[PDB]
């Protein structure tokens, strides 16, 4: 039974939803959480989709070491020194001090790029396109939250190297679109594609692209995934070079990208679609789409009810519906109703003795709570149609929620007003770091830049000025409070 209310105490609601749905168990180490099968199945679904898509682009999976030597991690300016407090260091095996401390990967640039340098011995060795599914550790300073901000997390990280900037540029947007597909088509979460400002972009790259989602309940936006064009920044640092085809004796530096997406996805799904009855799973990622529960309780008559439930589950597996028959005798129908509702199963298939004799059943959709009596003969078609509509409804409702909470403002006064109402807002922005710092300080709790959107809500007025008082606007920029 879900106790807490989403609009009252979000922290309590979230904790209750992730535990009662059997997604998460708490660990004795801060910021670490056990991913039980219910949570892990969602990651496997995201993985199956994304992996097949990057394979089509020619990306190959690999596995690089988790340990990075002190030398390698600090070899070059791969990361700003401000990341130092996030690195977890192994310093001994048993009671025996290691000659040099070793770091647990916070990301794999420093481990992969020296290998890239060895492997690139001519123009013929490019492109290199590698991905790995692995765990990552960062000793996060912010309050830890299951999925959203964890000390250990699962991710994929892709790292590509090309001869030309144009090849690289294409991939950045192709991957970002895949991330947008993960959120919008799998998880039914609308996102805003954009580029990070000078201040917020990855310091090791030329430009950073991002997808941003919004969590209404929190009044906070969240970065869903990241895709960088690194340019020649890392290839100059690690000497990833090839001979110029036309001119003898000239070095050419490889163009590089990196991109990543994490189990944060599941938290966003939870925060966006979850209600006061628990988790709500988009049909596309639900490992159980339909749960069959026998209702009502002769000895031979119960055998026939079970047989009908088994008939429904056999037929549903025939049309590639992911179905579970909960034929357990140790649990009451009521318990089961609640159990699978908390777990967010899109459709409950109720079979009673009364409905069975009328050659019919009841379909209860998780999202709206709507109950539909349908005839037995149309089980395959109707249930597949309801699953499709649940997926559409979840996306539609979240889209209207984003449309409501993301508006335009052109002055600092209206900006403050809209941000304090629990919304994010697109403002004319000069792009300066000075001004961005100033925006953060004045609104503080303080609003941060999220992205410069690819497709802003409004076009910029001819000669429009920044929310500042000294500079013209370069672009509409999405600002808000964030995770």
Ligand X SMILES: Nc1ncnc2c1ncn2[C@@H]1O[C@H](COP(=O)(O)OP(=O)(O)NP(=O)(O)O)[C@@H](O)[C@H]1O
Which residues are near ligand HFG by CB under 6 A? 79, 83, 86-87, 106-107, 138, 157, 202, 226, 258-260
Q: Which stretch binds ligand X (CB under 6 A): 150-158, 162-170, 308-316, 393-401?
A: 150-158
Residue 150's binding partner out of ligand HFG, ligand X, Zn ion, none, with CB under 5 to 8 Å set by partner kind:
ligand X
Quick check: 96 binds a copy of itself (CB under 8 A)?
yes
Q: What is d(CA 337, CA 323) in angstroms, rounded to the nearest whole number?
A: 15
| Nearest one of 331, 370, 379, 330 to 351, comparing CA atoms | 379
Q: What is d(CA 372, CA 374) in angstroms, rounded to the nearest whole number?
A: 6
Q: What is d(CA 291, CA 285) in angstroms, rounded to the nearest whole number?
A: 15
107: Cα separation from own chain's centroid:
17
Nearer to ligand HFG, 151 or 308 (CB): 151
Buried b (16+ CB within 10 A) or exposed e, 331-358: eebeebbbbbbbbbbbbbbbbbbebbee
Quick check: 197 binds ligand X (CB under 6 A)?
no
| 435 known ligand binder | yes
**From residue 98 to residue 137, what is the string marking binding to a copy of itself with x (rule CB under 8 A)?**
----x-x------x--xx--xx---xx-----x---xx-x
The DSSP annotation for 122-174 comes to SGGG--EEEEEEEEEE----SPPBTTTB-SEEEEEEEEEEESSHHHHHHHHHH
| 380 known ligand binder | no
The DSSP annotation for 400-423 comes to HHHHHHEEE--SHHHHHHHHTTT-
- Asked if the peptide bond before residue 402 counts as cis, ω within 30 degrees of 0, the response is no
- Which of 309, 349, 430, 447 contacts Zn ion by CB under 5 A? 430
In the complex, minimum distance from the CB of residue 79 to ligand HFG, in angstroms, rounded to a whole number: 4
Quick check: 20 binds ligand X (CB under 6 A)?
no
* Backbone torsion region of residue 389, taken as left when φ is above 0, otherwise alpha when ψ lies between -120 and 50, otherwise beta: alpha
167: Cα separation from own chain's centroid:
26
Nearer to Zn ion, 189 or 419 (CB): 419
Q: Is the dihedral of CA 162, 168, 172, 173 positive or negative?
A: negative
Contact 259, 158 (CB under 8 A): yes
Residue 177's binding partner out of Zn ion, ligand HFG, a copy of itself, none, with CB under 5 to 8 Å set by partner kind:
none
Q: Which residue is nearest to ligand HFG (CB)?
A: 260
Quick check: 419 binds Zn ion (CB under 5 A)?
no
| 138 known ligand binder | yes
> Token digits for 66?
């988790």
| 432 known ligand binder | no
Contact 221, 299 (CB under 8 A): no
Quick check: 225 binds ligand X (CB under 6 A)?
yes
Residue 223's binding partner out of ligand HFG, ligand X, a copy of itself, none, with CB under 5 to 8 Å set by partner kind:
ligand X
Quick check: 153 binds ligand X (CB under 6 A)?
yes
| 228 known ligand binder | yes
| Site of interaction with ligand X (CB under 6 A) | 107, 138, 140, 149-150, 153, 155, 223-226, 260, 262, 264
* Binding positions: 107-109, 138, 140, 149-150, 223, 226, 228, 262, 264, 430, 435, 466, 468
Annotated binding site for ATP: 138, 140, 149-150, 223, 226, 262, 264
């Amino acid at each position: 039974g879900l106790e807490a209310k989403k609009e009252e105490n979000l922290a309590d609601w979230y904790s209750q939803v992730i535990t009662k749905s059997e997604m998460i168990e708490y660990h004795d180490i801060s910021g670490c959480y056990i991913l039980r099968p219910w949570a892990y199945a969602i990651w496997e679904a995201i993985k199956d989709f994304f992996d097949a898509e990057i394979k089509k682009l020619g990306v190959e999976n690999c596995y690089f070491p988790m340990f990075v030597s002190q030398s390698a991690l600090e070899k070059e300016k791969t990361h700003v020194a401000d990341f130092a407090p996030e690195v977890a260091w192994v310093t001994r095996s048993g009671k025996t001090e290691l000659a040099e401390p070793i770091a647990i990967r916070p990301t794999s640039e420093t481990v992969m790029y020296p290998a890239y340098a060895k492997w690139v011995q001519s123009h013929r060795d490019l492109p290199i396109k590698l991905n790995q599914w692995c765990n990552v550790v960062r000793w996060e300073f912010k309050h830890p939250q299951p999925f959203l901000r964890t000390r250990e997390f699962l991710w994929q990280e892709g790292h590509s190297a090309f001869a030309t900037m144009e090849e690289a540029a294409e991939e950045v947007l192709q991957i970002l679109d895949l991330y947008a597909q993960v959120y919008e088509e799998l998880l039914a979460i609308p996102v805003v594609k954009g580029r990070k400002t000078e201040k917020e972009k990855f310091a090791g790259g030329d430009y950073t692209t991002t997808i941003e989602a919004f969590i209404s309940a929190s009044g906070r936006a969240i970065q869903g995934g990241t895709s960088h064009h690194l340019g020649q920044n890392f290839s100059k640092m690690f000497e990833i070079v090839f001979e110029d085809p036309k001119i003898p004796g000239e070095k050419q530096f490889a163009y590089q990208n990196s991109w990543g997406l994490t189990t944060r996805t599941i938290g966003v799904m939870t925060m966006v679609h979850g209600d006061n009855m628990g988790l709500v799973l988009p049909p596309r990622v639900a490992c159980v789409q339909v749960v069959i529960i026998p209702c009502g309780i002769s000895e031979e008559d119960k055998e026939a009810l079970i047989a009908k439930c088994n008939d429904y589950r056999r037929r549903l597996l025939s049309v590639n519906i992911r179905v579970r028959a909960d034929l357990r005798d140790n649990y009451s129908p009521g318990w089961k109703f609640n159990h699978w509702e908390l777990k967010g199963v899109p459709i409950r298939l109720e079979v009673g003795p009364r409905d069975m004799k009328s050659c019919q059943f009841v379909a209860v959709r998780r999202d709206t709570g709507e109950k539909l009596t349908v005839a037995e003969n149309e089980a395959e078609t109707k249930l597949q149609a309801i699953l499709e509509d649940i997926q559409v409804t979840l996306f539609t409702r979240a889209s209207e929620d984003l449309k409501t909470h993301m508006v335009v403002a052109n002055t600092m006064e209206d900006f403050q007003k809209i941000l304090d109402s629990g919304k994010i807002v697109q403002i004319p922005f000069c792009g300066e770091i000075d001004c961005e710092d100033w925006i953060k300080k004045t609104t503080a709790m303080g609003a941060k830049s999220l992205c410069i959107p690819f497709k802003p809500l409004c076009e910029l007025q001819p000669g429009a000025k920044c929310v500042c008082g000294k500079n013209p606007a370069k672009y509409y920029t999405l600002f808000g409070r964030s995770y």
